[PDB]
Amino acid sequence: AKLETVTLGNIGKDGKQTLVLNPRGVNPTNGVASLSQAGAVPALEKRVTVSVSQPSRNRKNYKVQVKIQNPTACTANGSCDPSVTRQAYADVTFSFTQYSTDEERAFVRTELAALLASPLLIDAIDQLNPAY
Amino acid sequence: AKLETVTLGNIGKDGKQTLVLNPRGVNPTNGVASLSQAGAVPALEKRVTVSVSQPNYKVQVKIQNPTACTCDPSVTRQAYADVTFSFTQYSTDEERAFVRTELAALLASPLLIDAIDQLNPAY
Amino acid sequence: AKLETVTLGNIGKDGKQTLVLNPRGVNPTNGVASLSQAGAVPALEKRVTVSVSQPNYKVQVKIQNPTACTCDPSVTRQAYADVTFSFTQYSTDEERAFVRTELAALLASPLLIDAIDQLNPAY
Amino acid sequence: AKLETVTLGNIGKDGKQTLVLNPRGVNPTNGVASLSQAGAVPALEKRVTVSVSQPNYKVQVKIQNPTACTCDPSVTRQAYADVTFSFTQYSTDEERAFVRTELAALLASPLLIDAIDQLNPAY
Amino acid sequence: AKLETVTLGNIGKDGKQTLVLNPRGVNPTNGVASLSQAGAVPALEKRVTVSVSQPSRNRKNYKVQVKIQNPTACTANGSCDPSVTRQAYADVTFSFTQYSTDEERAFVRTELAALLASPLLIDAIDQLNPAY
Amino acid sequence: AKLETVTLGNIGKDGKQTLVLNPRGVNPTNGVASLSQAGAVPALEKRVTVSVSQPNYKVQVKIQNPTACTCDPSVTRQAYADVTFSFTQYSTDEERAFVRTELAALLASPLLIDAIDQLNPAY
Known part of the structure; x- marks a missing residue:
């Protein structure tokens, strides 16, 4: 669809966070928004x-x-200007056939979403606790 | 982290469906639940x-969803979703939490739904 | 599922014995609990x-039950029981369950008790 | 012992089914009832x-349970269960009986029901 | 036995310390708790x-x-976030035969324990003082 | 650090035993007491x-405990315990002290006793 500012709301551990994402154009050399x-x-x-x-x-x-990348920056490690210390990444890829149905895809999407809310997954990611 | 049954609700295009996932052990070869x-x-x-x-x-x-069309129905195709998160040993739990939730929220974004459900890129 | 201390009760000829099995790990080489x-x-x-x-x-x-005879004890002999189940990727709950239960029931059937306990063939 | 019509009761997932086996002879070539x-x-x-x-x-x-799908029906697949017991010529009533019962008990143990009925490995 | 939170108490040089250890599951690929x-x-x-x-x-x-590993972290070495400076390790291994008796093992365990309280050992470890 | 006799008390499964260790010099080859x-x-x-x-x-x-069964009783088996601590030149005495005591305390933990005394892993 058309690139617009996306406003993710009620995010974060506390569910009380918001993020605004301004469109940054689409690179044609690789078709990446x-x-x-x-x-x-x-x-x-x-x-x-x-x-x-x-x-x-x-x-x-x-x-x-x-793909989503979120850097964290040390504001003052005995210097004048902040620098990136860590980077957090999440990579997602969906694969669909020429005959993938309208709903078939939607399902996967919504499923992954719901999954990310499952306590099983929250513990895995939030607290690097393997399922056991 | 107890591997239990997981019931996903309000799923699907119409958001009016539910999927129940039964725990199925952990392969001792890769430690994959x-x-x-x-x-x-x-x-x-x-x-x-x-x-x-x-x-x-x-x-x-990872998610694998086969589809079949009918004595033994055979699988016609499979839909796949692959996700991987990476964090430094110094990542605060707050950080991963953020990323996770962000992704989740993003998936509900019209921008994304159109790209996945309709395979229409952004422009 | 996950390993737990298993307690089998009312076992043996008199059916008045109990067995306590403790989790001993899973060999990652073959995935054997x-x-x-x-x-x-x-x-x-x-x-x-x-x-x-x-x-x-x-x-x-598989189940092994050693018998010691008497510095250090020694295993004079062991009793073995080897079981295997085969099901196609189109098998179902009902099907597997049935087999499982049937075998169990058979093992309680006089016909079999005589075969095993008394090493008495059927004719 | 001698062959008799065997009736297994309270079988299956719901444990509300019954099986009736009839003597079908013994093959003199290998002595298999x-x-x-x-x-x-x-x-x-x-x-x-x-x-x-x-x-x-x-x-x-051994036990074979065929599944038909539908001029003439055909067996699409079968479920198998193969069991063998080994005992030295110095084994005893107590010993064999024990093994027999133990196996049975195990087959009723959730640990195993999950393994079979749900094709869920233990870890 | 079943993994549970272990609460070591009355530890430390002053014997007035406590440590809680939350179970983190068991890795099947190597059977490590x-x-x-x-x-x-x-x-x-x-x-x-x-x-x-x-x-x-x-x-x-x-x-x-x-095995036990205890890292110490410099809270602020002219930066924004703490980092590990030192690591302390203790590695223990017991070897027992197929005929090791119930008590034989227990003994060793308790012995090692008692040993760790001996002044001989406390000086050796606490103050890196070789026996002499 | 004076190499003296060391009496260990309240040891054993029952915690009602004692072991006396006589100093035995320091091998000048490895500097091992x-x-x-x-x-x-x-x-x-x-x-x-x-x-x-x-x-x-x-x-x-390191601990070495031989066992014998009886003119000259021979050693049947040996039990071994091997421990090694490692610390940076910047480790505070407080730190090693902690580790040491921690280990000690841990050895009294039921979790450990079952794993060693009974060789039952954690699950």
Whole structure:
């Protein structure tokens, strides 16, 4: 769809967080849409990207890929300007056939979503606790 | 982290569906937990797998949804979702939490729904 | 599912004995779960092993019961019971369950008790 | 002992089913006793076989349960259970009986029901 | 036995210390039980692990292994976030035969324990003073 | 650090035993202090060794307990315990102290006693 500012709300552990993502255009060389946070200092911008690849003799499926990168910056490690200390990444990819139905895809999407709310998954990610 | 049955509600395009996932042990070869659709025959089970890399950390989740058309219905196609998170040993629990929730929220974004459900890219 | 201390009650000829099996880990090489009766000497412990092949599915259960005769005791002989189940990837709850129960029932049937307990063939 | 019509009761997932096996003779070539559920079509009959090796003694029980799908029906698949017992010529009543009962008990243990009924490995 | 929160008490030089260890599941790929301290930042968690290996054609003995790792972190070395500076390790392994008796093992365990209280050992470890 | 006799009390499963260790010099080849069971014959002495690496620092303790069954009783088996501590040159005495005591306390933990005394893993 058309790139617009996306406002994710009620996020975070406390569920009381909000994030605004301003569209950053679409790179044609690779058909990647980029979304960024307001911070006008590239190195510290939270980012999100999406791209859909159509099948092409080598690949016979559609691939929807979403990536999100969130850097954390040490404001003052005995210096004058902050620098990135850690980076957090989440990589997602969907694979669908030429005959994937309208609903078939939707399901997966919504499923993954619901899954991310399951206590099983929250413990796994939030507290790096393997299922056992 | 107890591997239990997981009931997902209000799913599907109409958001009016539910999926029940029965725990299915942990493969001792990769330490991968597996969940499958309840009441289904193995050859047609919808899967979900979770694994938490122990060292850099990685949390990987995968979804496999076969579709069949009918004595033994065969699988015509499969839909896949692959997700992987990575965090430094110094990542605060608050951080992962954020990413996770962010992703979740994003998936509900019209921007994304159109790209996945309709396979229409962003422009 | 996950390992738990298993307690079998009302066993033996008189059906008045009880067995306590403790989780002994799973060999990652073949994925074989192992249990055993907490004995004083490991070599004299009664054991049970379980393996559910992940592919046709194959569930296999083995049980070894050593007999010591009397510096250190020694195992003069052991009793074995080897069981395997085979089910196609189109098998169902009803089907597997049935087989499982049937076998059990058979094992209680006089016909079989005579065959085993008395090493008496059927004719 | 001698063959008799065997009736197993309270079987299946719901434990509310019953099986009726009828003597089907013994093959003189290998001394294998055979029983089966009196079905309309022989090819669709559930069967059980028993053999008590006369030498180490070896008691073996096998059970086949076919599944038909629908001029003539056909067996799409079958469920199998193969059991064997080994006892030295110095084994005793107590010993064999124990094993027999233990196995049975195990087969009723949730740990195993989950392994079979749900094709869920233990870990 | 079943993994539960272990509460070590009256520890430390002053004997007035306590440590809680929350179970962290059991890794099947290697049969290792892991215990960790509450700190939800992997890099700074005090850890303890135990595992029992059964004999297997290459090894004809049981091996009970316990390991404990305790990192110390510099809270602010001219930066924004603490980092590990030192690590303390203690590695223990017991070897027992197929005929090891119930008591034989217990003895060793309790012996090692008592030993750790001996002034000879306290000086050796606490003050890196070799026996002489 | 004076190598003296060391009397360990309230040891054993019942915690109602005592072991006396006589100092036994320091092997000038590895700088390893050795202690042995008092009143025992060398071939059957229960040992304890301690060594403190001088450079990274290492404190290593080992225990050897032979068992015999009876003119000269021979050793049937040996029980072993091997411990090694490692500390940076910047480790505070408080730190090692902690680790040491922690270990000690841990050894009294039911979790551990079951794993060692009973060889039952954690689950």
